[PDB]
Structures are given as structure tokens and as C-alpha cells.
């Protein structure tokens, strides 16, 4: 069961610390960058990416919630990002292109849709994905309500996979806890993108919050 | 002479130590909040002023180069900001009920032009500001071109001023450096935003940065 | 079977005559909110709702053709809505979120359909809808060719309901009137949204109106 | 002294009275057509036009708050506008043809500033208009702050009106009341935009009310 | 085996040369017109419908990658366009509207779709277009690369045309050249749009440049 | 006195013809490149600017329209552009910029106002232009009324590059014909935009064309 921490959820005073114990321990970065515009809010961006670079090995994951994608993949890359997650709300009309951009550039690709978009929205470029992550809260910010009707869409994707014969890694983001860990496995879930209730909340001291969301995982 | 350093030139490894010799040695913390719209491109947010909130005692000054400011008043107050400096060309047929709204938070006004807009564009509302601000390069990046234009804007702003009898300071933002420190006093600026060219570049120690920068100054 | 009077198409003159007798023979009150963005044209508002509501007891269904939905919940709320009717075109990416604010204001939650978006846009939230509208027009005006092939979209609404054990109404929006009220009904509408040439032009007088409308609608 | 009742603040449940008061006291129908984008509101259409037409003698004019004044004015014309009054903020690049739009259509011209837009803005076809109107108030709602910066640019409207030889009406928007109207006058006001707080507050019945403005005008 | 030269591609020294060759060998002619917002680039418009209408006997059809195909369609029937190609992507809330303004205007309905839009797009409407078109490129240039995964778009619009008993046209527009007509073919498609690729280049002069082509498909 | 052919008004079945004509005539090659957006309407575009290079030796100006010119700078030098016309409109925050990306490509500068746009407006950069266009008509298309008004414009311009010492050359665009081109000259203009009107209407052999035109101007 892979881990993807969400920094903008994490503590910047400590953050060489933060960075370098996620980077030993979890399989992704995840990096939020926002439009003001896609979603209603504003987060990380480039310069954040950047930072993160100095001390990363594990992969930098960034989700695009941005009306314009096209404009940060050069950027993006330029500042460290190992993988581009688009939403595919964003991209009709440039998918295969910008697809063919991010390979470009050496990085991974990634899928993620929002609450109310159906999977068939990926169908003729499904199979181009690394990742392919599912909103489980509609996007903009943390500590939002789990929405269990996303449950159908994980095990949609998990089937469409096996039938299809893909290899892409399942990912949530939304309300990742001790109230869903269950749920979102049996649904089929690979990665967890975890925040503020699902770790950073658990203690002040990462090492020690890590351990209690480690734990938590195991039931 | 005030000093404002800009933190989307700051380095997060060292964020605590950074934040608080700034606030320590620093009149205000310079905190860009950009649109990927307004301007082109994404740096730092309400989350950044959250953080460093925890360990300011200086005011905190965000500057909105986004479409729509209004969207960021009451999250901004909540967060910890102490200044927000908005755009006149954002402010159109809200200038009066945003500046309200920021006073109602118990924030002081800035004011910013971009480098093509007259000070006129804030004449009936100039009167209600705590620091103005001139662009001397084009808003969005780090290391732009200087815009030798601008010093006249500066200096015309001195004269409203003493003219008016206002009390507002005169702030510059862009390429503050030891090539440009002498006509920007000349021409009347109060606050220098300092960033990579006139602070952090001189030497990895922020220490260091600040007594080169700081002796700099002197001429 | 259910009607709805389309206010946009009401005699202000006889304002207070009118919802008297509307209050007092439909079911709801039919008040559209335009954009003059997500259609074309304008018509009511929060002020003609607050009107509305003084005399009203029936619930007020305010049907949002607007670019941002999320801007007039509240204000609504506030005017006394008791239906708050979303284009699920609106609200990718805050479907769940808007629903939630709407039941927060002790609303009822409606959903609909322009001609040209598919039923599915609504799966992973049609079981949160307490009446579902199928516009049988493009959205606007009052007045439009009535388009046939929303009585599939009707039928497979009715469908859906009953494979799903749902309790949504079924709503239609769009020259309900004697060419129409048998197809329409026959395909599976329960409420008919009455406007120009369903009611308010058979007579001057509403009382005459209403009678030859409930006439029409026998057959 | 002129009058010009904002009918965004009239009562509906006495329409029809109140409009033939209004017609046989006031000078003119102040109709305020709002987009939700180019101020934050929904207030009033052409359906309302529409509707006062049916019983006005005297010019119905339309305040056009809206990103594409170009879209209302045939509309606007055909139901029963004598008024267009423009925003010169929404016709840069196509002022001239929309004036000319306007006379075609037999309309008269109307010219509306808000707060922070300079007289200047309308120097080149200024001499085009029959009224100009000062918001004293940020557009888009009732019971909004005064403005008392504002008292300056009625002023310099009056005198380039003289200095130029020109001959429009100047008019007031936005908080006109016992507080206002006699610096409102001595700056140079023709014409005076009551709304709730300077005539439909005064008394529940209009006749009564109108007395109490009428009065308070007095001085 | 139809063809419809792409205009966007040809030689405007030879203009009317290369139009009355086209005139007397193809079946339509290509007319791209784009909007800089819909698709990131610019290329025909009604002026170059106007010059081709002076010389065409066989049908013009306008491509509009914009975003407002509403603002064109009068235009484009007055510059002398036979063939009005909307995207189904730019016409929800008014598909039916502008179906039936294009007849009005006496011509024939084309639909387009981009790589990511699936054909159900157009399920309620798809029975009202003469031509229906399937993008193998992401729109915007010439020169991009195929998208073998339309190859099942192609099949699927057959199958449906066969099984609902319909008529349309199907055309094929992106990289048509001699690697791909097989194919293309063996899918389903009757119009070929031919380019750079696939005619403009083979020869300077398009008599020449024409046989090529014509021998290339013949396999 | 110059000219400078408006190419959205030639005729391309005699392409190669005119444009010959012209480069050995004309002083500039004036090509319209439309949004859609910025203005109304679409005209030329690179692809047109490309094939007109094919044959010119006098410089092509491109005069662009655009919501957003910075996205058309590098893809108008590759096509053979000599000159970029900015609308100061859509240029706040970025003039500086642009005016040195223009340079960087070895193009000139152009700045262009539209009939309601102060002269002030590029007051911080007017001495960085090569040439300065006053638009006699509202933009988007040809054989608009002429607007009187601006000659003040143009005298305006006249004087302040004589009170600077500066050098740009003075435009006129729209309805430059037989009625317009005394009053023209007598306000300032240095440059003549030749449209339908003042051009090519008056034969359909551009010889003759000229002739006519010379002849005119003469008085
Ligand atoms: O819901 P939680 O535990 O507070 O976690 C918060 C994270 O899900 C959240 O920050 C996520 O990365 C964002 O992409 C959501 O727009
Ligand atoms: O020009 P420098 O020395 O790299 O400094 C960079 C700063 O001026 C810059 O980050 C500033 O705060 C921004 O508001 C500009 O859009
Ligand atoms: O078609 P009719 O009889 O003129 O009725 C008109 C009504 O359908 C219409 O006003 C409806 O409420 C609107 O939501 C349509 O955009
Ligand atoms: O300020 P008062 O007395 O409540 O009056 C309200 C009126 O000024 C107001 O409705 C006005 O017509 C609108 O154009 C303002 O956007
Ligand atoms: O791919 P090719 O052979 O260069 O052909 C180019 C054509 O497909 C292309 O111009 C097409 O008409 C446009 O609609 C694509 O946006
Ligand atoms: O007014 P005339 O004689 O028809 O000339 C037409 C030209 O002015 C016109 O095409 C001009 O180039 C465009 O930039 C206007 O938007
Ligand atoms: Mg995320
Ligand atoms: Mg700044
Ligand atoms: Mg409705
Ligand atoms: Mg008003
Ligand atoms: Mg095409
Ligand atoms: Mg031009």
C-alpha cells in the first residue's frame, strides 16, 4: 500500500526535516498547484516544487487543479517534477498532446478526476497513464467530506484495468483516515495521498505520526 | 531606509531560521500571492502566510497579483496577514468595498501599479492607503529587466504626496540591487523589496546576505 | 400531476393577484435565474424571489442558469428559496460540496438537464435530488421549438428512477403545453413547468387560464 | 431637480401603483440590469422593462451593469427602453458603435462612471451623451456607503459641461438621501436616483413616502 | 472515396489556380477557421470564404474551432460557406439553436469531434448532421501526429449510423497521408480532409501533387 | 506620405499580383490578425503573413487584435513579420516585456489605439514605438463611419513627439479615403492605412486602382 503525503498539508518550520523523512519513507510527493480559477484556491507552485527538489529521490507528484496545464509542464519540469497529473476535465481538445509533451520531458503521467467525472471521460488515452487517481472529496482544500459514492469508481477502475490489461497504480485523494483506509482498500485503491486527518494531525512530531498512521493502515 | 524582503526568493531548508532573522532585522515580509491569470505564473499563497504567521511579529504583506482579489480578503485575515496590497487594475468598481472589507479585518491598505499604470488611477482613493507600490519590472517573476521609466512614477508619487499632505510610504518592487539603490533614493522610495539580485544571491548564509546588502545600502 | 408556473412569463401588473391564485392551485413556483453567460438572456433575480416570498407558501424553485451557481446560495436562502435547481454543467468539481451548502439552508436540491447533457453527467449524485428537470429547449427563452427527442431522456430519468429505488420527480422544462402535455406525460414527467403557451395565453384573466390549462391537461 | 426611482427597490405586490405614481411624479424609471459578472449581482431585465412599458409614459432607463452591453441593446430597444445608459468601462473599442447602435434605435444615451473611472475616460464622445450619471457608491447593491470622494467628480463634470458648451443632465446613483442631497446639489447634481433609504423607506404607502422626500429635498 | 482539401494548407500565389483545380477534382473545401482561445493558433476566416466563394461551384465547409460559433454562422452563410462544421464541445446549451439557424440559413450541418470526445456527445442530436467528423490529431495545426485510437472512433460512428439507419458522411481530419488511408478506410471513413501531408506536398504543382495522391489511395 | 495596404481588403484570386503591386508601391504591408475576442470578428493570421513574405521586400505589419499578442510574437517573426502593432489595451503588466521580445526578433514596434484610448495610456513607453496608430473607426472590420474626434488625437500625437523629441512615425486607420485625407494630413498623419474604401474599390485592376488613389491624395 503506497503513500503519497500531501505537502500542503505539511509544517514549513520544519521542513528539511519533513521532507527528508517522507522522502526515506513514502512513494510519492504529492504537490497541489492551484488555479484560483479550476478550483477556488491557491497553494503550492513551482518554487515550491523546486525546494522540494533539493532533497528528494522519491518522485515529485504534481496535481495540476489549473484552467491552463499547458502552461506549467515546462516549468514544472524544469523545477523537478517527476510526475504531471491532469485532469482530464482540462485537457479536451490537447490530451494526446500534452501526454506527448510530459514524456517529452521525462516524466511520469498522471490521470486524477473530480468527484463528478465518469472514467469513460479517459477511455481513448486510459491506457497512456502511470497513475490514475480518484477525487474522494470535491477539490480545492483539506479536511473536506468523504464522499463514499467515489467507492464504485475505484472498483470501475480497478476492473477496467484487469479487463483491459493496464498497469496503472489506483490512487485517492480526499479523506484519506482511519475511517476510510478499510473502504478504499477493498474498493482497490494502490496509493493513499495522505494530509491532515490522515497523518500530519496524529502528532506534532512526524516521526511519531507516520507510526500512528502506519498503524492505523494495518486494520 | 525599510526593507521588505520578497519570500519567493527565500530558501525553505532553512524557513525558520530565514523567517525569523527577517523578522528580526526586516520592516515587512513580502508575500507574492499570484493568479497563473493576472500575471503568468504561480509562487506563494495563503497557506505560506499561514506558516509564516507562526513565527512573525512583523507585518506580513501580501501582494495580490490575482484576477480576483475579492476571493482572498477574509482567507488572507484568517491566515494572519497584516497588509494586502491590491492592484488598481483589479479593483475596478470595488476599490471603495475592498479597502472597507481589509479595514473591517483590522489590515493596512497597500496600493501596486504595474508598470504601464498612472498614479492617477488611484487619485479617489490614493488618501486611503498606508504604502504605495511602483513596479520597476513587468509582475510575475524574479530577475526582470529594470524599467529606468518607473523613477519618474516614483518621484511624481513623492510630489502627491507632500503635495496632498499624505503620509503613505513609497515602496519599489523589482530588481532592488546595488545597481539601482541610488536613483530609487533619489527618486523617493521609502521601502526596497529585496529579493535574489539585492539580498539572497550575496551568500548561502542569510547573515552574510544581509550585512553585504545592508552596507550596500549605505551608498 | 404536478404544475409549475414559470414566473418569467407572469403579468406584473396583477402581481399580487396572481401568486395568490398560483399559491393556491400549483405546486411550486418555476423562477429562472440567468447569467446572461450560461444562456443568453436575463430575467429574475434574488430580488423578485424576496417578492415572491411574501406572499408565498408553496415552495419557490429557482432554477440557476449561471456561471457560478455557487455565488447565489446564500443569497437565496436568504430570499427565501425553498428549491435550488443546479445544470450539472455548472458544477463539475463542486457538485457535492454546493448540495451540502444547499441542505445546509434547509433547501431542497434539484437537478437539471440541458438538451444536449446525458442523464450519467448526474450518476454519482442523482440519489441526492429531490426533483430532476429535462429541459425539452435550449435554455434562454420562452417560446422555443419543443425539441422530441428529450422523451427518451425522460423515459430513461423514469427508468433509472425505478432500477435504482430512487424518489426524485421528474420534472420538464419547455413548451409544456396541449401538443405536448401526452407525450410528455406518457414518457414519464410528474411536474409540467407551465409557462407562455401552457398557461398565461389561453386568457387575461389567470382564473380562466388555469381552468382551460387543467382542461387540456385531462386528455 | 429631477427624480429617477430605482426599481430595484419598488415593492411588486403594488406594481402597478406604484409605477403610475412613479410616472406622473418622477422624471425618469431608473432600471438597473445586472450580469452577476460585471458587478457580484442578478437584479433586474428586460421582462421588467417589458412590463413597466406597459403603463410608462415617462423614458424607462436602463443601467446596463453587464460585460456585453452590445448583447441588450436591440432587445432592450424593442421592450420600450428610452434610456441606455453605458458603463464606459465595458465599451472601450466600441463606444462609437454602440452610441450610434442606440440612436438608431431612437434611444437616448446615457454614460455611467463608477467610483474609480475618471471623467476623461469619456473624452472623445462625451459630447455624445444626454445624461451623465456619478456612482457614489461600488456598483451592484442597495444601502452601500457613500462616497464622498465622489462630490469631486460631480464638480468637474459640471464644469467641463460649461467649459465645453455641452448640454447633459448630471446624475446621482447610490446613497442619495437626507444625508447627501445637499452636497449632492452643490457639487452640481441635476438629477437625483432615490432608492430604499431616500424615498421607499420614508413609508410603507408611496404617496407618503414621496412627501417625505420631497420634503427633505426642500433643504 | 471522397476528398475535401484542407485551405490552410494550400499556396495563396496560385490561389486561383490551385481553387479551380480543387473546384473540379474535390468534393468539399476545407475552410478552418479558428479562434486563438478554442485551439492556440489562427487561420482562415469569412474574408477567405468570401474570395473561395467567387470561384466554388462544389460546397465550402467552415471548421469552426471557436468559441463562439453562435458569433459566425450569419457571417459565414453571407460569405458564401455551404457546410457549417460544429464541435459538439462548443454547443451544449444550443445545439438545437444553431442546427437549426445554419438551416435556416440554407446550409448543411457538419459535427467534429476532438480526440477526447466520445461519440455519444452527439446521441441526441447526431441524426440532424449531413457530415459528421472524426479528429485523429489534436486540433489546432497541421503536421501533428495520427491517433491510432480514433481508428475506433471511426467504427463505432459506422456502426452507429448502420443500426440506427442514418446517412451521414464520415471524414476523417488529421494526418491523412499514405500511412494512414488504408486504415482509415478499413475503419469507416467516406471523407478524406487532405493536407501538407497528404497533397500540398507531394509536388508544386497541384495537378501533380493531385495523381500522387489519387495513385496513394488506390491501395 | 506613406502607405500601407489594409491585405484583409485585396482580392486573392490576383494575389501574387497585388502583392507585387504593392511591395514595389507601398511603404507597408498591413495585415489585421483577429481574436474573435478582441474584436468581433477574424481576418488574417500567420499563415496569411507567411505567404505574402514569399513575395514582399517592404516590411508586413501585423496589426494584432488579440486578447493575448504575447502568445503570437515568435510565431509572427518565424512567418516573416517586420513589424508587431500592440494594442495598449492588452498589454498592462507586460509592455515592457513585449516591446523587448519584439526586439529580441529584430521586428519594430507599433502601438495602436483604439477611437476611446487616451494618448496617456502609453505615456511610460511611447518613446520605445517606431510607429503609433490612431484607429479613426471602431475596430473589427471595414467601411465603418469615420470619427471626427480623433484628429484631435492625431494633432495630440503630433505635438507630443515634437515637445519629446521623438521620432515615430504617425498612422490613420479606418475610412482613409477622398473625405478624410485633407483633414488627415492637417491633423498630422505621416502614414495612411488603405482599405476598401480608399483603395481598392475604385477599380477592379490595381494599376488603376493606385492611380486613382495617388491622384486623390495629391489634393
Ligand atoms: O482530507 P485531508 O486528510 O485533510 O487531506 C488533504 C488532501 O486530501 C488535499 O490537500 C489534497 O491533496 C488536494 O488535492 C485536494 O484538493
Ligand atoms: O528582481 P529580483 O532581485 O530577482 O527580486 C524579485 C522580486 O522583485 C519579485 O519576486 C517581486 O516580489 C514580485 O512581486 C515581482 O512580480
Ligand atoms: O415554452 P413556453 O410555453 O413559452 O414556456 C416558457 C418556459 O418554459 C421558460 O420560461 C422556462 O422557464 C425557462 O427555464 C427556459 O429557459
Ligand atoms: O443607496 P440606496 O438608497 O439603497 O439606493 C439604491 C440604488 O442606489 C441602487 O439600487 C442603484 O440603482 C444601483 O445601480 C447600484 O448598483
Ligand atoms: O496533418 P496534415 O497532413 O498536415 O493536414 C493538415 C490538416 O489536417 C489540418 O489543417 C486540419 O484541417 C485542421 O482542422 C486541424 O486543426
Ligand atoms: O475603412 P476602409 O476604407 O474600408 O478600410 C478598412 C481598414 O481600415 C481596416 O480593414 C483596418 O485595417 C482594420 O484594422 C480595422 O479593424
Ligand atoms: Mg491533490
Ligand atoms: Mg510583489
Ligand atoms: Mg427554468
Ligand atoms: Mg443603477
Ligand atoms: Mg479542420
Ligand atoms: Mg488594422
Same mark, same amino acid.
Given at each position: 500500500?503506497? !503513500? ?15 521532507? @527528508?523523512? %517522507? ?30 527538489? /533539493?532533497?528528494?529521490? /522519491? ?7 489549473? $484552467? ?21 476535465? $482540462? ?7 500534452? !501526454? ?25 488515452? %486510459?491506457? /497512456?497513464?502511470?497513475? !490514475? $487517481? ?14 463514499? @459514492?467515489?467507492?464504485? /469508481?475505484?472498483? @470501475? ?46 502528532? *506534532?512530531?512526524?516521526? *511519531?505520526?507516520?507510526?500512528?498512521? $502506519? ?5
Amino acid at each position: 500500500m503506497k !503513500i503519497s503525503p500531501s505537502l500542503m498539508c505539511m509544517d514549513l518550520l520544519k521542513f528539511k526535516e519533513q521532507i @527528508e523523512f %517522507i522522502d526515506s519513507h513514502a512513494d510519492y510527493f504529492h504537490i497541489d498547484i492551484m488555479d484560483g480559477h479550476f478550483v477556488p484556491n491557491l497553494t503550492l507552485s513551482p518554487f515550491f516544487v523546486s525546494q522540494v527538489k /533539493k532533497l528528494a529521490t /522519491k518522485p515529485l507528484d504534481c496535481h495540476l487543479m489549473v $484552467t491552463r496545464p499547458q502552461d506549467y509542464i515546462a516549468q514544472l519540469a524544469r523545477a523537478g517534477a517527476d510526475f504531471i497529473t491532469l485532469h482530464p476535465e $482540462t485537457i479536451n481538445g490537447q490530451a494526446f498532446r500534452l !501526454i506527448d509533451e510530459i514524456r517529452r520531458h521525462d516524466m511520469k503521467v498522471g490521470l486524477i478526476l473530480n468527484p463528478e467525472t465518469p472514467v469513460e471521460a479517459m477511455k481513448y488515452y %486510459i491506457h /497512456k497513464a502511470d497513475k !490514475i $487517481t480518484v477525487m474522494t472529496v470535491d477539490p480545492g482544500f483539506a479536511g473536506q467530506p468523504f464522499i463514499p @459514492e467515489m467507492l464504485d /469508481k475505484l472498483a @470501475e477502475l480497478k476492473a477496467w484495468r484487469e479487463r483491459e490489461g493496464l498497469e496503472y497504480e489506483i490512487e485517492v485523494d480526499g479523506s484519506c483516515n482511519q475511517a476510510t483506509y478499510e473502504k478504499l482498500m477493498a474498493a482497490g485503491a494502490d496509493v493513499f495521498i495522505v494530509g491532515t486527518s490522515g497523518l500530519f494531525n496524529h502528532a *506534532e512530531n512526524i516521526d *511519531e505520526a507516520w507510526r500512528i498512521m $502506519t498503524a492505523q493502515i494495518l486494520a
